A paper describes a structure:
Expression and purification Recombinant HA protein from A/Darwin/2001/2009 (H1N1) (Darwin09) virus was expressed in a baculovirus expression system utilizing a thrombin site at the C-terminus of Darwin09 followed by a trimerizing sequence (foldon) from the bacteriophage T4 fibritin for generating functional trimers, and a His-Tag to aid purification. Although protein was expressed as a trimer, only monomers were purified by gel filtration after foldon removal by the thrombin cleavage step. However, monomers were still able to reform trimers in the crystal as evidenced by the structure reported here. Overall Structure By using x-ray crystallography, the structure of pandemic H1N1 HA from the Darwin09 virus was determined to 2.8 Å resolution. The overall structure of Darwin09 is similar to other reported HA structures with a globular head containing the RBS and vestigial esterase domain, and a membrane proximal domain with its distinctive, central helical stalk and HA1/HA2 cleavage site. Darwin09 HA was found to be structurally very similar to the 1918-pandemic HA and the pandemic potential H5N1 HA in comparisons. As for other HA structures, the Darwin09 RBS is composed of three structural elements: a 190-helix (residues 184-191), a 220-loop (residues 218-225), and a 130-loop (residues 131-135), while other highly conserved residues: Tyr91, Trp150, His180, and Tyr192 form the base of the pocket. Although six asparagine-linked glycosylation sequons are present in the Darwin09 HA monomer, interpretable electron density was observed at only 3 sites in HA1, Asn23, Asn87 and Asn276. At these sites, only one or two N-acetyl glucosamines could be interpreted. Results using recombinant HA revealed a strict preference for five human-type sialyl-glycans, with no significant binding to avian α2-3 receptor analogs.
Author numbering:
A (entry chain D), F (entry chain F): 2 to 172
B (entry chain C), E (entry chain E): 0 to 322
C (entry chain A): -2 to 322
D (entry chain B): 2 to 170
């Protein structure tokens, strides 16, 4: 577990409908939600792959399970029952544990993505913004819609805003 | 101040999954990995229909019990279906030898043709081929017998040594069945075959067996104190089968040219059969699925999901759901 | 100089338990649980609260036929599995084949109801044959020549062995197990001496069973002093069905049969472990296993609702953390 | 692996006896250990679940393994032996690997919890405290027992102390 | 301003692995977990060579078919090899009873010695031991018979009751085989054995069986209309086997002292046998491997990797490779 | 996933040949690559162990798979075919998934090592160096070969350089 989902970012957003992870901005021009398209798309690809793997690796033989035995063939009839039950016990156990393990990992996968999205942003702004906690950043400067998007695709210009920011931070 | 926040999706969803650490965790998205739905029908497997017997056993059907010729006889099937009402079989009581092995071998054939190996009209000029009929196998109210065998009996006061061969020219293997009859008493043996001390011999390249009548009174079954044992063999292409007898031989009339398949099976079920395509069949119905597991039935035929005992196998795809 | 100090940390303790991981062997942890059951109680116990049949000195063969050594056994109407010992040695005392013997032991594994009764009462069933001189040195009792309790070896009366004929209809509402024997003398002189008729035959019949038997007269190598042989046969007569015997010599006739209700899949264990008043849900030839755990390394051949057998010696699951004092 | 246990926090505490993870304070009023109750409790819940899962998912049929064969049935005797041995090999392999994989993950789980407890704290204090390393924080201001506890349950008041701290910094 | 950077290895490599989340990820280092190579040879298993039959069946080899004594007979083997050309077996047509069980029991023996239980020269003074030869089993152009059996026939006009025992003093078990002959016609029965109504008995401590001739004409095989049935039994140390007969008995000449092993098998293959050591053998060749899986062949003998259907099982050891 | 490999450190180094993880310095005396010996060695140890585990835990019985059945024994012949196919299907499915799960974790294992190596360094220098991103630190002071190596084995002297650094941090 990476500590983000139900962690330092304590809740989800029913408001963000077009993706799994994203942003909520609030500036002068308005507020709203936008899903991060790139990392959402990547995740749906990888999770699709996981499901398809668990399904498609199952090699399956044409076979007829049933067998018929005569009243003087209880032993082999019971032998046959032993093999059917044995397979039942291994497939049941494996399937249950597979689901339990993968679920645990899928949930942590998502946690990891959210945490990396957060760090991707902290990394960029540095001390041009205040970490409020709860996954939010308060800018020490005006950040308009173009500024906001420079952040969303990794092209934030730190030096551009450093003076403005440091004035509001300190004096 | 102006603020940017990182967050994650939440929604309507009420699906729960389990993990090793936690039970009943609500997730945003999710997929079931366990197939639990069937179509309630018996279907064609790899596009070829099953043989459906209705009123009859396999025994009833290959011997040609009089009740079993309402069945249109196809040259191809992918498996065989008997019902809980499949009751007409050997109407004259006796053992059917290696019966289970016969049903296995007959499971699935890619080609199957019934033909008259020993034509009734010309095969037995020195023996009676018409009075071989019993209250144990009734047809339209009257005493009858199996369609695929003939019960030969003496003509006048004589049962001369019978001798008859067939060479398998069919190019496939042919299934031939015959019976041997065990009278109740000496008076009955003599009455039907003349010769006390009769014998039967049947032979091929690989098969050889002598049969003698076991004369005694058994407990009455369908009004009979005697018994008939039923036998069968597969004659290979090019091989020959010969019958020799001084009484008691219930002779083949029709045999079967066929090409065996591979592992299919017999399902016993009252599920109705449909024009309908499947790749996995169970006694309850067919399964059309991509999924690796099913909990519908342990005994399936075809290319099937693995049978398991679980009731749900829900895989998380989305994240924990925290509205 | 120094401001206040707050530190973050984790438990360490006494523990010396080690576990293995994929990356590391022998990692000491604080807390830990074993996943592999390696203890049994050294006893043979009741399975689902019903006791096994314990045969002691005898085979299954000797017990159902009624070998003279085998009636020190209290015969219960119910058992959950069958125990033979390494000393289970009294069986068919007159040498021969027991046909479909292993199938019989399978079928008799576990019965929910079992009752022995006299199908053909000795005192009134055979007025035209000798039911008292059917006794041998091969099956000794209190020093004297004897025979199985559950069968009778009929022999000619004076100079005649008339055609014998005898039926039983199963009115018991359960199925009944009936056993019989056919005797193959050593020589023509013996055959005639015992049954008069050279050329005797036997026939046995039900609705599903039918078989004729003829004596195979010849001298076999001596076993328990016998050069002849006896074959043992059995069949299960369904409720409402009838079994008939017909014979002109060589038939060792039933005296007692068994009404019973078969169970499902049980088994026979051969073991010298003692049997106890004692409850279990999993039983092995070494002893019972009372466990919640999924795996065991006690024995591959178990009966009941068991942990899966494995070859490992330890399966320790870490619950606590790496232990670093 | 998350880098905390036997990592940047190099050792464990035999002194902390009432939990799996926790704190050691040292101020003016005294020093001592206190386990973090909430995250300890949460962990024992989840690890209990893990153990119960590995145990309870094992569906088990009533069966009798043993079978008896006659001297002319060596082939089916051997068939039977083959199915016993087959199961033995798959249950042995899975059990061993199950234990190995889960242990690795349980240790990493704990590492993760400790790292998160540490970050939960660094998050709160920011530059009111000096990261010494070894999982310790040195406060730039007086932090009494009531201040200490405000940190322990996430209610630390950053502005309250910022002036005092920045003077000492 | 100078600089320290953290980084990671990249290289030449083009190996790819799959993960649950991603297919075809290039990695720096990597190991295959699936054995897909065999040596194309049949080898010694636990350092003892297999018995290689060549031209023959097991049947032909233990009975002593005349074509089968080009085979050097070793006292030890680890498994048995038949070829697709292993064709000389029972040359006089008939059933070989419990044949497959014989082949299983003979799979692997730690000790095996052939000896003359009933020496030809002195065992049968009242029966003819030289005229027991047939066109069905030719040797150097001439009519012949199995080396290990003798086909006794009447001397002049008499077949007296024959009686003969062997006690097993070998300390191991001994395998003995014998046959019983079924003539074509009464004229042949009488011609060969004199006594119509002959019988045979064979007995030990556990074995007992009477045999009577089944006289009839079967379809021709290798020019014979009669048949011969072959039988065998393992006599325990200390036990005795006795033969009694008034005709139709084909008598043992050589038997086999042996110590059975445990579970080995028979492979049918045309792969050549080599002086060569292995711990896992397949019909295609031997597998010398440390790895847990193989996709060479499902039917192996020895201590083998588990057979799987996959074509690659590449485990990543290095990291993602990013040039 | 820990966000380092093909993450914030976007590429690998074909230049570093003597290990899995390491450094690239550039000062006044020259530049070059050096693998981190201790953490590389440790990783090769643990991965060796993982491979050996997956191989050595396979307990293997001496057995002969093949069996031969007569023409009236198709039922047991088919029983036998059922068991062979049953084992095929579980060994195929487990092997495939075992490989898939372990690979996924091996790659994340490596990501984790790299990330911890980075943090081991940021931890030491603090504000005596500028985090450039891409896993690089720019020193606010002169750092010769002996200084460089003090960093590489965890013995960097922070106070020693603090004044020089903080002067340059202003300018
Ligand atoms: C076909 O089966 C039917 C019914 O299963 C048989 O009909 C019964 O015959 C019995 C026995 O002789 C009679 O007592 C009953 O009147 C009939 N019962 C029922 C339920 O219909 C019939 O004998 C069978 N015929 C053949 C040729 O197999
Ligand atoms: C019972 O077994 C003993 C043990 O060898 C034997 O001596 C005795 O004859 C047997 N008695 C009967 C009746 O089988
Ligand atoms: C031996 O086998 C060959 C070829 O398989 C066959 O043609 C020949 O007649 C056989 N002869 C004997 C004596 O078995």
């Amino acid at each position: 577990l990476f500590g983000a989902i139900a962690g330092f970012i304590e809740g989800g957003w029913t408001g963000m409908v077009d993706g799994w992870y994203g942003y909520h901005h609030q500036n002068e021009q308005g507020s709203g939600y936008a899903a991060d398209l790139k990392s959402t798309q990547n995740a749906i690809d990888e999770i699709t792959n996981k499901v398809n793997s668990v399904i498609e690796k199952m090699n399956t033989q044409f076979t007829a399970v049933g067998k018929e035995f005569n009243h003087l063939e209880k032993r082999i009839e019971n032998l046959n029952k032993k093999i059917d039950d044995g397979f039942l016990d291994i497939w049941t156990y494996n399937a249950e544990l597979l689901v339990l393990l993968e679920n645990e990992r899928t949930l942590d996968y998502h946690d990891s993505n959210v945490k990396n999205l957060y760090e991707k942003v902290r990394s960029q702004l540095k001390n041009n913004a205040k970490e409020i906690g709860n996954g939010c950043f308060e800018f020490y400067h005006k950040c308009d819609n173009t500024c906001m998007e420079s952040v969303k695709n990794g092209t934030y210009d730190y030096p551009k805003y450093s003076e403005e920011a440091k004035l509001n931070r300190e004096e | 101040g102006d603020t940017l926040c990182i967050g994650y999706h939440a929604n309507n969803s009420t699906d729960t999954v389990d993990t090793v650490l936690e039970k009943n965790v609500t997730v945003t998205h999710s997929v079931n990995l366990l197939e639990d739905k069937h179509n309630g029908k018996l279907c064609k497997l790899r596009g070829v229909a099953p043989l459906h017997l209705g009123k009859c056993n396999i025994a009833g059907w290959i011997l040609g019990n009089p009740e079993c010729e309402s069945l249109s006889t196809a040259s191809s099937w992918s498996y065989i279906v008997e019902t809980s009402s499949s009751d007409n079989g050997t109407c004259y009581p006796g053992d059917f030898i290696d019966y289970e092995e016969l049903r296995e071998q007959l499971s699935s054939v890619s080609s199957f043709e019934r033909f008259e190996i020993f034509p009734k009209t010309s095969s037995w000029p020195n023996h009676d081929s018409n009075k071989g009929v019993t209250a144990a196998c009734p047809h339209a109210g009257a005493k009858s017998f199996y369609k695929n065998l003939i019960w030969l009996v003496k003509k006048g006061n004589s049962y001369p040594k019978l001798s008859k061969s067939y060479i398998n020219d069919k190019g496939k293997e042919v299934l031939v069945l015959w019976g041997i009859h065990h009278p109740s008493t000496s008076a009955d043996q003599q009455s039907l075959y003349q010769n006390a001390d009769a014998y039967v011999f049947v032979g091929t390249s690989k098969y050889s067996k002598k049969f003698k009548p076991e004369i005694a009174i058994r407990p009455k079954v369908r009004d009979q104190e005697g018994r008939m044992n039923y036998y069968w063999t597969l004659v290979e292409p090019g091989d020959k089968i010969t019958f020799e007898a001084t009484g008691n031989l219930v002779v083949p009339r029709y045999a079967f040219a066929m090409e065996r398949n591979a592992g299919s099976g017999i399902i016993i079920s009252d599920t109705p059969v449909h024009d309908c395509n499947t790749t996995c069949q169970t006694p309850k119905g067919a399964i059309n699925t991509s999924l690796p597991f099913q909990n519908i039935h342990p005994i399936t035929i075809g290319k099937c999901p693995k049978y398991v005992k679980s009731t749900k196998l829900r895989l998380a795809t989305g994240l924990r759901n925290v509205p």
